[PDB]
Design a protein that fits this description.
Oligomer: part of a larger assembly
Radius of gyration of chain B: 35 Å
Strand order of the largest sheet of chain A: 6-8-7-10
Order of helices and strands of chain B: HHHEHHEEEHHEEHHHHHH
Strand order of the largest sheet of chain B: 1-4
Chains: A alpha+beta (305), B mainly alpha (424), C alpha+beta (333)
Radius of gyration of chain A: 22 Å
Strand content of chain B: under 5%
Shape of chain B: elongated
Order of helices and strands of chain A: EHEEEEHHEHEEEEE
Number of helices of chain B: 13
Strand content of chain A: 5-15%
Shape of chain A: globular
Largest sheet of chain B: 2 strands, antiparallel
Helix content of chain A: 10-25%
Largest interface: A-B, 100 and 97 residues
Helix content of chain B: 25-40%
Number of helices of chain A: 4
Chain lengths: 305, 424, 333, 333
Amino acid sequence: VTDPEALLLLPRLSIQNANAISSPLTWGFPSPGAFTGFVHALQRRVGISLDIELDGVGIVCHRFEAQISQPAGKRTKVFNLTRNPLNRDGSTAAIVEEGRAHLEVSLLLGVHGDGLDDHPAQEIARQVQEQAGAMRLAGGSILPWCNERFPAPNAELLMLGGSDEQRRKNQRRLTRRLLPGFALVSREALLQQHLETLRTTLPEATTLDALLDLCRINFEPWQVRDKPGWLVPIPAGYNALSPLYLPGEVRNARDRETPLRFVENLFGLGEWLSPHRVAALSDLLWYHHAEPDKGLYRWSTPRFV
Amino acid sequence: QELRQFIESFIQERLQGKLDKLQPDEDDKRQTLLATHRREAWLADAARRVGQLQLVTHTLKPIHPDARGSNLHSLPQAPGQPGLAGSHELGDRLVSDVVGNAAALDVFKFLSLQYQGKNLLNWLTEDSAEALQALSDNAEQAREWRQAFIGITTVKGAPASHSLAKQLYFPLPGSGYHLLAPLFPTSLVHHVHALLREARFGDAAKAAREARSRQESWPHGFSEYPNLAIQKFGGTKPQNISQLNNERRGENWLLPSLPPNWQRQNVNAPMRHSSVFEHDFGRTPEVSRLTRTLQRFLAKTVHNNLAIRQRRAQLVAQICDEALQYAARLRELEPGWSATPGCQLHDAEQLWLDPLRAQTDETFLQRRLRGDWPAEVGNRFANWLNRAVSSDSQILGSPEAAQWSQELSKELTMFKEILEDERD
Amino acid sequence: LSTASVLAFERKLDPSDALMSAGAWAQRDASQEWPAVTVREKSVRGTISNRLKTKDRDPAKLDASIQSPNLQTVDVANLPSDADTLKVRFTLRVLGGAGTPSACNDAAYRDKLLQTVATYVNDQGFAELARRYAHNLANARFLWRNRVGAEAVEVRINHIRQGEVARAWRFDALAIGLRDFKADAELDALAELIASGLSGSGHVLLEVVAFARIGDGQEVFPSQELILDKGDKKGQKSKTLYSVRDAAAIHSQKIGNALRTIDTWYPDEDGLGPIAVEPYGSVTSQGKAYRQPKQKLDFYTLLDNWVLRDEAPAVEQQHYVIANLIRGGVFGE
Amino acid sequence: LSTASVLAFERKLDPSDALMSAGAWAQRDASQEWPAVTVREKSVRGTISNRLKTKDRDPAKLDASIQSPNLQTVDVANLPSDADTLKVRFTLRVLGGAGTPSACNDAAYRDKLLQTVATYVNDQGFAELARRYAHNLANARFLWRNRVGAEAVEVRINHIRQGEVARAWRFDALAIGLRDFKADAELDALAELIASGLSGSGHVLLEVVAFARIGDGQEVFPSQELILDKGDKKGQKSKTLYSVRDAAAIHSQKIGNALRTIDTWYPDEDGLGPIAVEPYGSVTSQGKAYRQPKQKLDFYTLLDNWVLRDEAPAVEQQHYVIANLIRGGVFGE
């Protein structure tokens, strides 16, 4: 839950065949919990032998299309699909719709390990980069190394140790390789004080992000209101309403040595920011925590400003 | 007592919509069948035929054709942290419509208007004293109706699951794993559809289009909803989930979530004459939108100085960051970067847009093809600041008029720090 | 030890969606800058050529309806008038850990399946499956309709360990067929590579480049997408193709489906050649699911009696089970 | 015996788009660098030349609607002013394996259909049908309206197998006529080439150059997309032309449709002119359908009474069924 000993960037993590919808109320860029699970699985298959520890992620989202189409010029969109194989009766399958996108990202992390304490620097960085491209991240395989490998080997950029002015120039030595994207950070305090400031009509809580992906205007009794960025809802955690269970209590879990809880979605909003407009790059990580006293199994960006 | 003095009348008002389902002989048998319910015995027949169902508010049977899942719409509160937004409560217009397997709609369509205006929906679980007085029969038929009502929201506590329930590990803080199977909240998505269909056509569309067409507005809540995609759950055979009729044939649509580079953007600084060879432009359409958003608030009034005290210079720094993003986008689509027809202004304008290292350069290649002199970029930023908004000779009487020049100097300092190592 | 009722496997040999680009033959070995064959727009005027109903024919209504035809604006992807070839380039990888499920309840069923796949690998190698998955890269089956009528189609494969070719092989895709499986000398070294990388060790990476000389300006066939109906009867049909970076591309699942044509062991006949290895092995271009649950040769019966009941099937049809392990799926009921 | 509910075919005669370009006669031999006929636009002004049923045809409506403007913008393509010829150049390639269907349900229907086509082929070759396709390239019918009123049309057809020329053919497309099918010793060699490419013996790529001289700065007729006569701001685009990379052109289905004008065997007339082979063989211009399903002689009756009901379709008209298979389409229920 701490700023790292050292950062670790992976400049063109070109991925492919991702999941677009990721939640029942949006379809764009996938959930940040997919990336936190990605780095937990990377920590599981790397840092138990190389002794590091990964907590937060950094999204930059270079380019993002989606297999979507416009039906007959309506004010809506549709999805492109994939052909399911043949049913046992052999007429057609029960066709089911899901969004599948092909995005671009670069992930910076947070390390509590010995990458330059008892192991050398680019050996650890190169083995982690070479081993990262063998696993999926959002239901989609990473597009492997190609002509994009030519800027892909990286440093292992320290933060916690160095000169202060060179702390500045190391984090903006990391910013120089990160220009054409737009980073994702949460707006938790903006959620709080923007629902509480605008409580002059009703106190409802789920109507906040349900009333921001639209052009709000109280026009002239032509002046479009001051948009503060890119107001867009995100899946911001998991409320587990029903209590805990057991592997023998509810059968058909994945492993029978880990407990089961039925869960529901939660919607905060996440602004999109250029990386220049931050406090520091250690101030944008999507961490993880679980509060089993509550139902809140919620990830977060602590200290986004 | 609106189950005999309105329930005999309701079975009679279905005995006027029972003459439609009436032939002579087979319809006389159908009148005997449906008048063993719509005459005196609605509770016993309804509890016999529909006694073991499962209503819901967010189920998971419609995530696969022949799968299994959970049935729980409870947890009507979440008294914890006020930083999220979900299904902790609906508040007003409480709806509950889950599919289950309930096929007889006419047995659950002549029982819902006993609680619209009264408390006949308050006996759906227990405490049926008026529910046993509003039957006219003994404890047997009212007990059959109470069984069919207490099974309509049956909650055992421990549901079951199928292999395709999308079961997800969530990591504890340095500890084990509580695996989560999320579901699909149906009445919540239809609540979103209630607000969206209210504000997409009918009232607000006709109002906003005609109003902002010519004059016809008292300014109210009117808005536009772009970038919503259609998500279907059966297509042309929809029998998966509930709330599914012939306008809602999988008609669940989906609010936008696109990133900061969703659509495409055309280039404006190629290695040509009008692209880079005439380099005192700084042209961009997003820069034009940022300039229009600045010029729409180019006058600091006597009220909004608290909101206009960190929204102008910060917006100018965001415009400089957008120029840096344009430089980064130009910093990948230049395979051939060197001297050519249309590179006079791009010979100094190619500092931030650093092209590839020229082979024709000698050992002194750091002067024309390796120019690490981003000091005239400060001159270009000064030209852009002078050409952004016309600074008048008497618009600096307050502490934010020369402060515009202070913000321009801060933007020039940020540009000098950014281009301190541009060609190098 | 029973069936683990949440059971799954991952993709191994999971290729990427291949871009397409065109140019002239004998300028083929400088193919890093060929222009993208983008999807374009044209529009057709149809007619009535449907099989209309048996007694709804009405020989005046037909003339009254042919005069008002249907209007479609379908898409196309032609070559330029200068181009003569077609480049198809994708990237392929194997993830390793073949028998290991990514989802399994029973640590008893998984325990039996451990030494099942372990004594399968220790008994014999994947060289059968190595040559069978190498004859869906060594010919050019992955270009599907672009193969027929091509006058010279060939595939250039080159394995990379560093950011450079370790060992390259160059083929002639119409020499070996879509139908026969034969061993070569430029092939068994590739087979040992894909075999020893396909087991549980790590990963492998192969870039596949195919040059289908389809003709001059003649169209190619990128895969289209499913759509729901659009709200118009004039722009109703559109035949929307698939593009990656403004460039017509074949889907990943189709170009991996062409890898997956392996089994000649389906009991009907050796006439169709191999089909896609599937649980309840079913072909779209044949209509009906071969290997019915009535006959023994469907997947769950083979896997259960080769794991639970320990009665091994013959090695002729054992490879089906490991081939749709490499395919992977979601299993259980 | 049942039929198939889903069945299809490849098209076996597949041409390209035909990009047009102008130039002067008798320097036509060096026509590798003629500039393309570029689609321009112009602004026309409409008038009243339409029928009026006299529901409002008052003494004011006509001399109001004359002064009421309906000015429009059309797209038109003229030659360069110092040019009198039109070059139309497409590539034609024949696949072969004419009757083997693409995707068919039954395994029983397809074997007797393939043997029906095979007993046709060794009964009689593709020779008459290839002659009838050759008379739609020798007679340059594929110039649709660019042929009428042309002084002299001629056709260059070379043969490409590699980047070379095997044999050439020069065809004076007006000396031989559109009306009668007659054989020439040089035309039957091209008939032999298409008859070999449709049999299966050797793939064939042909390019067809068409030098139709018209006149100095005259008006050519390329293909036209679906017009969008939309909700104008008083005068919008009313016809649009098919463009490629800065070149007007003809769609590939149009110069396929002009190439498969084969049958004279339709029962209404035989010498009035051949038409294009289709099920319920119909003309868009004539607005009728020859070979009604009231009659026997269409495709959907001959097919299921020659495959299933085993009756011979009277060899005079058996060529139609095979030509409609070479067309290819969507067959079945």
